[PDB]
Design a protein around this ligand. Structure first.
Ligand SMILES: Nc1ncnc2c1ncn2[C@@H]1O[C@H](COP(=O)(O)OP(=O)(O)NP(=O)(O)O)[C@@H](O)[C@H]1O
Ligand SMILES: Nc1ncnc2c1ncn2[C@@H]1O[C@H](COP(=O)(O)OP(=O)(O)NP(=O)(O)O)[C@@H](O)[C@H]1O
Ligand SMILES: Nc1ncnc2c1ncn2[C@@H]1O[C@H](COP(=O)(O)OP(=O)(O)NP(=O)(O)O)[C@@H](O)[C@H]1O
Ligand SMILES: Nc1ncnc2c1ncn2[C@@H]1O[C@H](COP(=O)(O)OP(=O)(O)NP(=O)(O)O)[C@@H](O)[C@H]1O
Ligand SMILES: [Mg+2]
Ligand SMILES: [Mg+2]
Ligand SMILES: [Mg+2]
Ligand SMILES: [Mg+2]
Lengths: 372, 372, 372, 372
């Protein structure tokens, strides 16, 4: 045996690599694009579909779409097309030799995990597989046993409280506000400056505006007063046609949707009150250890100043004698993959794989009574 | 006080009148024309500019242009010239005595509404004003509280879901396909018959072809089979030079762009799928009442057979146990003005005006925290 | 100031008079004759040159020639000799007191208009001048703003479409078939009867045959069948030597050259197809108003039956639902002067003159950026 | 099979040859002339019609006319006469053995392409044919996939944006200002020097003046100031009668009609603003690649200094951080034929022909659902 594969399929990026590494060798977006215009040059390399980094380059003529929406895979033809691109075109492996570690969000459909298991054996014919929960793997990456994990990615934000090795599945919150809903609110409030980004190729531009110019205001009602003297507030951004946009208070205002989800019409609470309501559903003897370990992960927790507001605004909810310590590693974008590289290389793990023999005598329903 | 003014400025027509009436006294196109040829007769009444019904008559020698494109006013010199023509030359009022109700599209620039407010006080010096959203006013005209409003005009098509008095601003779709983009597609597909309408004075002829000979096919793939036996399909039209054109399948084919916007190269969805995606972004307890109230308005919803296809094609998307009732009044062209005549004559409204005193101590930014 | 002068210099006649009158006081041909024989009576009043009505009387012993051929003045010594005869010998004015309105054909050389301007200031020293286009002035005489003008004179036939005060300079046709080319075709087809008019004094007789016995056939292929029974077709004419000529089908056949210019070997089209091709180069919204206003002017449009054939033969080209109205005033010979009398007496015109001060600081090139 | 024919039928020239060559073997003008004079020598080789290079030599006695005006073939008798001259008299082939590649302009009538297809099978009986779009073939000649193509010929100027193999048919502009409208403006402004070119045989002289003495001014308002000191500006040209003309500012002033079409009374924009408005109708992610690839083609883009003004005047419209690279090959006159020689010799193309069997069971309407 050489090694094992760790394929972190997310709603926005597909992180992939080998176990035992410290960074994924394969980071490309989870986009499958079909061309939508006519097509008039004969031959000269026109494929029926473009996946990932190729569709990101040719995106002006493509109808881009995501096969994964809010964690749930909705377009199993396109998801088998990304996995085919991930293993062959991007990692250059043989899938019949390496065991594959997959990740998915908690509180997810049963058929979403059975259908991953059916594809990895009946189509790729892997020797073994295992589906892990992402917020469990975010805590191997920090090398811990205790802590609540705020894993906010591109499709789903979810808290999982984990005390000393033991997960508390009744306190797992799942909030479907994520980075893809911050882009779609940003396309709505860039309209009030005048700039109209509508089609799906501009959705990948407003995503790139958000990753470069948006931050989290430490007090939202005071930065809106700073928009009176919009001097250091406004920044510029060069679009791929050469135009510039002067984005102003829309920098700090779209990540406030993480803290006030009523901006996009959701009745639910922000990520500071879904952390606090998930600690307050735990036992009273472990709430001191969950305050002191607030592990953030995922790429939506990469804004400048989001650890400073989570530490500010849980403290206004928690009793004043408990210390709050939001713990943000700088590598926290890939930490679901970093913990998957650790868990697949542990020596105590090689009896937890779902082998091909164990699958065949049990069908696709083996994955529920074996993984979690 | 005599009464209030209701000035519905659209991208294609300027509807204007007084509150409490049942029809606008002033319907003229929103066109400002400059002459482009030499000019050789001395004197005898040559103005520098021609606005509205006058420029529509003298259009053979004029460079006609619209100051409003896609809802956004782009040419504030010409828009102050239409308003000057609307009040003085067309309504024959004094603007310093009547409060003016203005309309504009939702999801619009902030500077578009501030600059209307700055003109109506610093130039016309009105006693009071109020900017209303057009799809709110389309629902007073039907005398209701509940319904999604498909307001398709000449610059912008937009859905606004309104439950029992409460607007849902996160489900407001805005699609910039409208009647001016159906004319420009019709000038492109009349070329394949041979007829070349190019200059801006022929743009007002193809607009008049579209308002007389175009309808909506109930099944587009079967009317294209009827173009084999083009017997009852083809109609004729007498041009203003005496020529006739025999338009064939181009009758039903340009309003299909409302239902398949890929004909003009837009990635977005048709008006039957922007209604359905705007209901599916509402709460699940109000989707039954939004199906049963589909208020159409605007002049682009005046084609023969557009209520019959909207009722056909939402039903193919909606679940089969929900009833769909597309509600098209016959007066639906002016229904943004009809609801503006109702709202300005309500007794509960006279504290919602932005008076001249309230403007002066607040600047032009009063209109955002007072209207909507 | 007394009044202004209107000097309509044509290729065949010099119409001159004062502004505000209804008929020119000075109508004499534009002929400068030199004697060609010996000269044997000593003294008794022999001048070196004879101009106009005097050379028309003494024409048997003179080499008559026209200084203006096809609108272009080619013999500037003789044209200064006609203007000297026009002002002093014929109007009896002082040129240093009256401003002079001049006319010329459209699409004319630049040096033709500069050299008129140089003569009227450096030789006659007029206070002011203005060069107008003849087909503009033909439309003041009918008191209008809209119409295409068929101005066919003795040197040039030209259409100028004029919509409501605005000339369309890209649709101005200029056809150099005129009355002097109908005389020269008539001298060629009177030869086939036997009568040989060759020298220049007989050119002024065939011009007088044409003004008295020639008409326009309403259908040319049927009047040629009437030449079989030449009973009412043939007329007689008494020459100035007492001889008679019996002109037959040559009455209607030389004005057919206006409608079929291939008789004199021109490739171009007739005056019914240069009117139609000049309307079809206009905008499609003004073609209805140019059909209903077909102003004829000039002396070549004075044949019996030319309005009846223009109305017949444009109708065969125009679409059948457009009305055609050829508009021939009875005074249409002088209508370039009649409109020049109107334009020079308008009150809105006295700032359009090129004064002597404006000329001196600008040279002769002022006339292009001031008149047209 | 020997090879295939590439017949580039243009409005001004008929380029023809074989596939796989680097230059057409048959370049002759698209002129069919009928004699117009009497004809008095008995026998000695007088045909009823003269086509192409023969009618160009004998043009003094012929009524020359073009069967193709603005891309649309209007005179199908004469166009079958050119094709008969092209294959038999000029290429000396048998049309029943070679498959024929035809070109035509985009946004063209449907009946123009059906009637080419009906002639090439029912009259010439070719084995196969294919109608291609000219601006697609202009991009094979530069050997590319990406670029907007400014193909300005003798009848039609049209932009076609082509990204990586995929044409964008909603951004295709078509402007009917071309070289034949620059000749007709040049015949109008040579009149103001005095020189009157009127009949159709002089239309082929002013075309030859334009191809030798006209250039494009880099700044039009400064070359008009250079016309004050007309020293290096004026050139001479020897006419075929031996006369000389001293053309002055009319050298640079007629190609300015390409950049200001209001000189000939067109309301539309120049070729620098129909390129920019066609890029601004594309997607925002491909506008960087269309700026860097501005392929000019056709013979109207052969003026000295037209690449230097297109690079100057798009840059004044484009944002200042985007590079503009107008790409003019020196062989750009024949580049529609050069790309047609490439496309007909590709190995991936031989299933795109419309064979004679495929035509017979489908009628003439096969060409729309098979070519484009
Ligand atoms: N620097 C950044 N600042 C802010 N947001 C960012 C940044 N980088 C990425 N994002 C957002 O994070 C999203 C992807 O983050 P990531 O956590 O990798 O997604 P994901 O984990 O693959 N989706 P999932 O695991 O299913 O929840 C992007 O779509 C952006 O919206
Ligand atoms: N009978 C008709 N059938 C089809 N289309 C029509 C008809 N009458 C008008 N139209 C089109 O619809 C438009 C009617 O104008 P209107 O509905 O008022 O647009 P508008 O409201 O002025 N623009 P806006 O309010 O900003 O959306 C015209 O410009 C035409 O393009
Ligand atoms: N009754 C008539 N019938 C037909 N032709 C006539 C008649 N009277 C004059 N003509 C012709 O008209 C010519 C003069 O007409 P006229 O229009 O006055 O010339 P003109 O206007 O001075 N030249 P121009 O300025 O170029 O129009 C004569 O030379 C004749 O050829
Ligand atoms: N050297 C030149 N300089 C400027 N213009 C030229 C030159 N040579 C040719 N032309 C012009 O280009 C025209 C022909 O160009 P060309 O592109 O070959 O015609 P064409 O492409 O066959 N017509 P079409 O294909 O229907 O657009 C001539 O009629 C001239 O007006
Ligand atoms: Mg993740
Ligand atoms: Mg409206
Ligand atoms: Mg005259
Ligand atoms: Mg060409």
């Amino acid at each position: 045996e050489t090694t094992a594969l760790v394929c972190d399929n997310g709603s926005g990026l597909v992180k992939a690599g080998f176990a035992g590494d410290d960074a994924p060798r394969a980071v490309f977006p989870s986009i499958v694009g079909r061309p939508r215009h006519q097509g008039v040059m004969v031959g000269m390399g026109q494929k029926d579909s473009y996946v990932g980094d190729e569709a990101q380059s040719k995106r002006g003529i493509l109808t881009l779409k995501y096969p994964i929406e809010h964690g749930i895979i909705t377009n199993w033809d396109d998801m088998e097309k990304i996995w085919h691109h991930t293993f062959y075109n991007e990692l250059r492996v043989a899938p019949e030799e390496h065991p594959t570690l997959l990740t998915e969000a908690p509180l997810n459909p049963k058929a979403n995990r059975e259908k991953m298991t059916q594809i990895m054996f009946e189509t790729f014919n892997v020797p073994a597989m295992y589906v892990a929960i992402q917020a469990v793997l975010s805590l191997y990456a920090s090398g811990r046993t205790t802590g609540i994990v705020l894993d906010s990615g591109d499709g789903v934000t979810h808290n999982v409280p984990i005390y000393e090795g033991y997960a508390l599945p009744h306190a797992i919150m799942r909030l479907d506000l994520a980075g893809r809903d911050l882009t779609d609110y940003l396309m709505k409030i860039l309209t009030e400056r005048g700039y109209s980004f509508v089609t799906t190729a501009e959705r990948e531009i407003v995503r790139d505006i958000k990753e470069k110019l948006c931050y989290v205001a430490l007090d939202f009602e005071n930065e809106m007063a700073t928009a009176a003297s919009s001097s250091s507030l406004e920044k510029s951004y060069e679009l791929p046609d050469g135009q510039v946009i002067t984005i102003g208070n829309e920098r700090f205002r779209c990540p406030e949707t993480l803290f006030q989800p009523s901006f996009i019409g959701m009745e639910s609470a922000g990520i500071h009150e879904t952390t606090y309501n998930s600690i307050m559903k735990c036992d009273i003897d472990i709430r001191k250890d969950l305050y002191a370990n607030n592990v953030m992960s995922g790429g939506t927790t990469m804004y400048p100043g989001i650890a400073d507001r989570m530490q500010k605004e849980i403290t206004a909810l928690a009793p004043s004698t408990m210390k709050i310590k939001i713990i943000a590693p700088p590598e926290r974008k890939y930490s679901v993959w970093i913990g998957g590289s650790i868990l697949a290389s542990l020596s105590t793990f090689q009896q937890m794989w779902i082998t091909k023999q164990e699958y065949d005598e049990a069908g696709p329903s083996i994955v529920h009574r074996k993984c979690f």
